[PDB]
Write a protein that binds this ligand. Structure first.
Ligand SMILES: CCCCCCCCCCCCCCCCCC(=O)OC[C@H](COP(=O)([O-])OCC(O)COP(=O)([O-])OC[C@@H](COC(=O)CCCCCCCCCCCCCCCCC)OC(=O)CCCCCCCCCCCCCCCCC)OC(=O)CCCCCCCCCCCCCCCCC
Ligand code: SF4
Ligand code: SF4
Ligand code: SF4
Ligand code: SF4
Ligand code: FES
Ligand SMILES: [Mg+2]
Ligand SMILES: [Zn+2]
Lengths: 208, 176, 125, 96, 112, 97, 115, 230
């Protein structure tokens, strides 16, 4: 035995692969790709306009009762043509499983709101809009949720600076709080921590 | 397995009905609550007479920071910046240069105590046990600047609390 | 059906960046040079976009290094020069592109250290 | 060994002292300048030089796990002492 | 028969078998509109006929619940209703068609 | 604790339980603040032979996720993500409160 | 893609229509904003500020960008109408505590290294 | 014409006389190395670059072995990993514990290659070796206990700078790199030995103790001290 190495679960891996094939066969119109990670997590990459049909299928189908919307977020990758990557994490209590559905979008392309499938999508999509600038088409109430009132810019984008552009203070002349351009007494110190030696041969990419 | 918290049903016999009616008319559970409160009244309080009595602590306690020395009096820090690198809050600033005798010693060692999260990573990463989080916690100040420590202040803290810090490190260094 | 926009993409009005940091910033798209102190080349794989350096002054108290430039620590990673250029163009910053420098292939031969009639012979091992 | 600048301000062990015309001296008015009176360089000078009869010595700062990482000092150059630089401690082979 | 289903908002049904037969028959009727080669039709028809066979061969509700392995009979009825609505929506959506559009050249690459 | 018997009896009557059996204040029953030195166990990978890191490198066993289906590239039974969850059994210890 | 998905408004004419509708909505709201927040500015000043904020995006020629801008403008308006904001943010629109930043080359050269 | 070799079963077309290390680099794999420098000659002494050929019972020094037709190079094989671990174990067994007080610090090839290719535990139960430091001028600070006898400085000195005042004296574990006399290595190209020394034995003296590599921000500019435009 290897005490320091996490054991694998071939049974769960095979079950997840079979279910991924099942959903890919059922919905060829949207499912672009299916993957199973080596720690037994199923992922489905679909076309962005199939969000509502795919989520409705995975929620209502007898063999896929993913009743609970565990999470809903986005990942920003500037180097891609469609930078934003919308991620849905679903939990199926009847079959005791979890699934992930990933779509893609850019700044100007709306993503259909999934509040008709799961109600938590309301606040989750409000947060996604507030933090990345992704607009959801049929949202009952789409507005900022976490940022300050009148805040400009979407903080969680990779190109948004860590400290932002404005800072607040109380100005006695006008007897109110004011927002002024950011100015740090001590600048955040950027560290270059990556080692120049390759760590994982298994993830090496072709030089191209 | 599972259990039901509220799934019981009351017996409808005459004695139980009369007991429930008596509880409704004569506030039995309210009297029970009064009795519990009276019991607590006659119990002994847990209040300690601060500041004449201090709450218990452990040798692992993280308090005010300090810079230590070897028994010879030489500073332990070797300007390796491991604490600065590992500091989650970036509350440590270090600048070094060769000393007059060529030693690798810091010229600036600042800790911002209004930025530090008192997480103790600096004393874990120190390979010479120079920076420590001492046992003192009563160091509240009337001005903001007094909480921006520098090398002189940290060395003063080390000299002031060296005995207790050394005793705690001796007591707890076998778990590290 | 589906509309068409025959114009260059521009999201500067939506990003929320101040006009000063939109107009007066020239980013630098390049592949970072290998750290000369190490022989590893794994840090010279991806293109990087970084902004120009602005002023840093000394704090009157504690002598720290202050700043007023929000984009001082903003470095972005791009897989391709075209991707980085497209991102910079759509965000509206000026950009300078530097071509990737790859070492030229070299002919190495251990037996050249013992040449009978050439200067490549080494005097020590 | 603290020293006093011509402006009356004590110098730290790093040689820090504001100039005569520096406005920043006003921060110490009605208050005090935090200076540590013990100088590590002076103390380590006060410490003597050990003499061991071996070419290589090992220093860990004393205390075992409480000291600095163990290092080895080569006592071959007789014109100077071998200094463990973690703790600034001098060792020397017995000459003569 | 049973007092409660143990779930808030899920009422007890006094006619489980009739409701299940009706719902499964409706689901099978809706699936007839879907093209034969569609993979959604085959799997759903298979599972529906498999579950509809159990309700017609077991009169006892508890043994039927044990055979179906879908929670209580009320949960099974609710899932049948959800499946019927999903079948109608899938009839509207027509997802058996080929892929709408392939993604760009490097859209799911990682790390990048 | 230190209290009169009469007050203890009054507390017992008012609360309905023997308080002295289970108090909420600590009287010398806790471990002393000074303890003998320990000697912690060393670990499983502290051998001097037959211990190569290539045989116990957890990170390097990680693999890129397997591509089950990629669009780029009989009658099969319908499947499920996993076998359905079995019904939870009621607790034998105390099924009802 | 050549066939970009439209948010709405299709071409630029409907986008301009939405811009004008949002401008009317903002214009009719400035007296209420001044009254409720007890601002010390004039109503004319508020209308001028709304006009200026509309005009700083006058160079946009993309219908999708215009649609996103009017969506965010409606969001800002609904923040103001429901008194979710305070006088703090409404005055933050005015930059009342900033020193006048120099714009000529000679003044920029004198003050510092800023381009 | 080009011959066909294989790296982990992937076909590569390389010129005759190309080394195993160069073939792996062409396919995209950087073989770990200490004594090998592309601008210098081939030494092949640190033995860190040993890799396994598919049918060869013996590992080959990838920095010095020319490739042959139909050679399958197993870069990440068990034999290669064991060889790298053994070489790193010997190096670190005789290496001193100076990392916190060593300017090489976070940009050390010995540290990085130890963390990527070597083991994480020490079986060395004996005392370590201590080496007397030399003095070769006001630019290079020498702490020779950290040297790994990779002979990069010697090869660079001779071949590039045309100065042959560096070399190894003695033999065995007592071999030392230096001048053997009190002679300063003064030349207009003497900082490159600081650059190419894989360990902290040769370090910059003006830069000593001032900073750590992760703190420094790198700005790519050019040189104006002469007309070369470096
Ligand atoms: C006297 C009180 C303390 C007595 C004990 C004592 O001295 O212990 C040493 C004690 C050391 O503590 P210890 O022994 O380590 O800990 C206690 C043990 O754990 C033991 O703790 P314990 O809680 O187990 O001890 C309780 C024990 C011992 O404690 C007592 O007996 C408590 C005191 C008597 C209670 C009844 C007072 C009645 C009115 C006062 C006049 C008669 C009583 C005093 C004279 C008695 C002469 C025989 O009593 C009993 O067991 C039962 C006593 C009867 C209870 C009856 C039911 C409760 C309600 C009573 C209502 C009374 C009428 C309403 C109030 C009227 C206005 C005052 O130190 C002190 O008491 C120092 C002084 C602390 C403050 C005393 C304040 C009260 C003084 C009298 C009232 C105020 C008059 C002056 C006002 C001035 C204003 C400027
Ligand atoms: S305790 Fe943590 S946050 Fe505070 S100085 Fe140490 S490392 Fe930084
Ligand atoms: S980790 Fe310790 S020795 Fe290193 S710089 Fe910090 S205080 Fe000094
Ligand atoms: S050369 Fe490398 S391994 Fe040796 S002490 Fe310096 S940092 Fe550590
Ligand atoms: S001093 Fe440095 S470059 Fe020279 S042989 Fe030793 S490790 Fe190599
Ligand atoms: S790199 Fe080949 S033996 Fe040193
Ligand atoms: Mg070096
Ligand atoms: Zn020492």
């Amino acid at each position: 035995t290897r005490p320091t190495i996490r054991p694998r679960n071939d049974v769960v891996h095979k079950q997840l692969s079979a279910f991924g094939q099942y959903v890919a066969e059922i919905l060829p119109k949207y499912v672009q790709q299916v993957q199973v990670s080596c720690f037994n997590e199923l992922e489905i990459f679909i076309h962005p306009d199939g969000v509502i049909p795919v989520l409705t299928f995975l929620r209502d189908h007898t063999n896929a009762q993913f009743k609970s919307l565990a999470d809903l977020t986005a990942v920003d990758v500037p180097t891609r043509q469609n930078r934003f990557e919308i991620v849905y994490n679903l939990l199926s209590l009847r079959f005791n499983s979890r699934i992930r559905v990933k779509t893609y979008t850019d700044e100007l392309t709306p993503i259909e709101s999934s509040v008709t499938v799961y109600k938590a999508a309301n606040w989750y999509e409000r947060e996604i809009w507030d933090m990345f600038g992704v607009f959801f088409a049929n949202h009952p109430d789409l507005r900022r949720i976490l940022t300050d009132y009148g805040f400009e810019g979407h903080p969680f984008r990779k190109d948004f600076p860590l400290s932002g552009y404005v800072e607040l203070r109380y100005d006695d002349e006008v007897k109110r709080v004011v927002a002024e351009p950011v100015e740090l007494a001590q600048e955040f110190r950027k560290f270059d921590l990556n080692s120049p030696w390759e760590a994982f041969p298994a993830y090496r990419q072709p030089p191209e | 397995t599972y259990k039901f918290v509220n799934m019981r049903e009351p017996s409808m016999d005459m004695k139980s009905v009369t007991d429930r009616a008596a509880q409704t008319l004569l506030w039995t559970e309210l009297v029970r609550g009064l009795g519990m409160t009276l019991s607590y009244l006659f119990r002994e309080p847990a209040t300690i007479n601060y500041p004449f009595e201090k709450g218990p602590l452990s040798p692992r306690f993280r308090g005010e920071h300090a810079l230590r020395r070897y028994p010879s009096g030489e500073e332990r820090c070797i300007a390796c910046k491991l604490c600065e690198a590992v500091c989650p809050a970036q509350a440590i600033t270090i600048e070094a240069e060769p000393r007059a005798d060529g030693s690798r010693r810091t010229t600036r060692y600042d800790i911002d105590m209004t930025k530090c999260i008192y997480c103790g990573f600096c004393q874990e990463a120190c390979p010479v046990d120079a920076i420590v989080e001492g046992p003192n916690f009563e160091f509240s100040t009337e001005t903001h600047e007094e909480l921006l420590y520098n090398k002189e202040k940290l060395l003063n803290n080390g000299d002031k609390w060296e005995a207790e810090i050394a005793a705690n490190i001796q007591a707890d260094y076998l778990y590290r | 059906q589906l509309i068409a926009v025959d114009e260059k993409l521009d999201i500067t009005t939506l990003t929320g960046v101040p006009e000063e940091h939109i107009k007066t910033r020239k980013v630098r798209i390049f592949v970072p040079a290998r750290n000369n102190m190490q022989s590893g080349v794994n840090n010279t794989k991806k293109w990087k976009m970084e902004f120009d350096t602005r002023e840093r002054w000394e704090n009157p108290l504690m002598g720290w290094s202050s700043t007023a430039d929000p984009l001082s620590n903003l470095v972005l990673t791009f897989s391709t020069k075209e991707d980085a250029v497209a991102f910079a163009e759509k965000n509206g910053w000026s950009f300078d592109v530097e071509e990737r420098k790859v070492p030229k292939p070299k002919s190495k031969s251990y037996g050249a250290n013992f040449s009978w009639n050439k200067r490549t012979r080494v005097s020590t091992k | 060994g603290v020293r006093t600048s011509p402006t009356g301000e004590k110098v730290t062990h790093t040689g820090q002292a504001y100039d005569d015309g520096d406005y920043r001296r006003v921060r110490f008015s009605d208050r005090q300048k935090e200076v540590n009176e013990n100088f590590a360089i002076d103390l380590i000078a006060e410490q003597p030089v050990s003499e061991v009869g071996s070419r290589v010595i090992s220093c860990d700062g004393g205390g075992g796990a409480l000291g600095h990482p163990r290092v080895y000092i080569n006592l071959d150059k007789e014109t100077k002492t071998g200094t463990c630089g973690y703790c600034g401690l001098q060792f020397r082979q017995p000459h003569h | 028969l049973k007092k409660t289903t143990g779930l808030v908002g899920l009422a007890v049904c006094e006619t489980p078998h009739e409701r299940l037969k009706i719902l499964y028959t409706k689901i099978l009727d809706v699936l007839g509109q879907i093209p034969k080669n569609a993979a959604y039709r085959k799997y759903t028809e298979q599972i529906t006929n498999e579950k509809l066979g159990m309700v017609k061969a077991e009169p006892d509700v508890k043994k039927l619940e044990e055979q179906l392995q879908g929670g209580q009979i009320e949960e099974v009825i609710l899932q049948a209703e959800n499946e019927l609505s999903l079948a109608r929506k899938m009839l509207r959506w027509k997802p058996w068609e080929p892929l709408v559009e392939e993604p760009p050249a490097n859209q799911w690459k990682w790390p990048i | 604790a230190s209290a009169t018997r009469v007050i203890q009896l009054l507390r017992n009557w008012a609360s309905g339980r023997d308080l002295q059996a289970k108090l909420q204040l600590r009287y010398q029953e806790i471990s002393k603040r000074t303890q003998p030195p320990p000697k912690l166990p060393v670990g499983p990978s502290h051998k001097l032979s037959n211990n190569y890191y290539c045989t116990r490198d957890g990170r390097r066993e990680a693999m890129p996720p397997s591509i089950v289906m990629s669009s780029q590239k009989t009658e099969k039974k319908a499947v499920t993500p996993a076998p359905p969850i079995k019904r939870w059994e009621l607790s034998k210890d105390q099924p009802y409160l | 893609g050549t066939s970009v998905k439209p948010i709405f408004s299709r071409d630029m004419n409907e986008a301009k229509r939405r811009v004008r509708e949002l401008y009317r909505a903002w214009y009719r709201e400035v007296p209420n904003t001044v009254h409720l927040f007890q601002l010390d500015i004039s109503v004319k000043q508020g209308r001028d500020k709304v006009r200026e904020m509309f005009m700083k995006n006058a160079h946009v020629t993309d219908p999708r960008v215009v649609d996103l801008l009017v969506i965010k403008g409606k969001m800002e308006l609904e923040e103001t109408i429901n008194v979710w904001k305070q006088r703090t943010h409404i005055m933050r629109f005015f930059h009342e505590t900033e020193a006048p930043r120099p714009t000529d080359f000679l003044s920029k050269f004198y003050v510092g290294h800023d381009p | 014409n080009l011959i066909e070799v294989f790296v982990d079963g992937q076909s590569v077309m390389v010129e005759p006389g190309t080394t195993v290390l160069q073939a792996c680099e062409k396919v995209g794999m950087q073989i770990p190395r200490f004594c090998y420098h592309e601008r210098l000659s081939v030494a092949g002494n640190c033995r860190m670059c040993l890799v396994e050929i598919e049918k060869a019972p013996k590992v080959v020094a990838a920095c010095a072995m020319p490739v042959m037709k139909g050679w399958n190079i197993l870069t990440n094989s068990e034999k290669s990993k064991k060889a790298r671990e053994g070489v790193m174990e010997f190096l670190l067994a005789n290496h001193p514990l100076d990392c916190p007080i060593c300017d090489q610090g976070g940009e050390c090839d010995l540290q990085d290659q130890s963390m990527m290719f070597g083991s994480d535990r020490s079986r060395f139960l004996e005392g370590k070796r201590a080496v007397e430091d030399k003095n070769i001028g006001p630019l290079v600070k020498t702490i020779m206990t950290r040297c790994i006898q990779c002979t990069r400085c010697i090869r660079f000195a001779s071949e590039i700078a045309g100065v042959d005042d560096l070399g190894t004296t003695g033999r065995g574990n007592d071999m030392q790199v230096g001048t053997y006399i009190e002679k300063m290595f003064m030349s207009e190209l003497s900082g490159n030995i600081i650059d190419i020394c894989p360990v902290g034995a040769l370090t910059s003296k003006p830069y000593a103790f001032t900073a750590r590599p992760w703190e420094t921000r790198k700005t790519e500019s050019i040189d104006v001290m002469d007309a070369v435009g470096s």
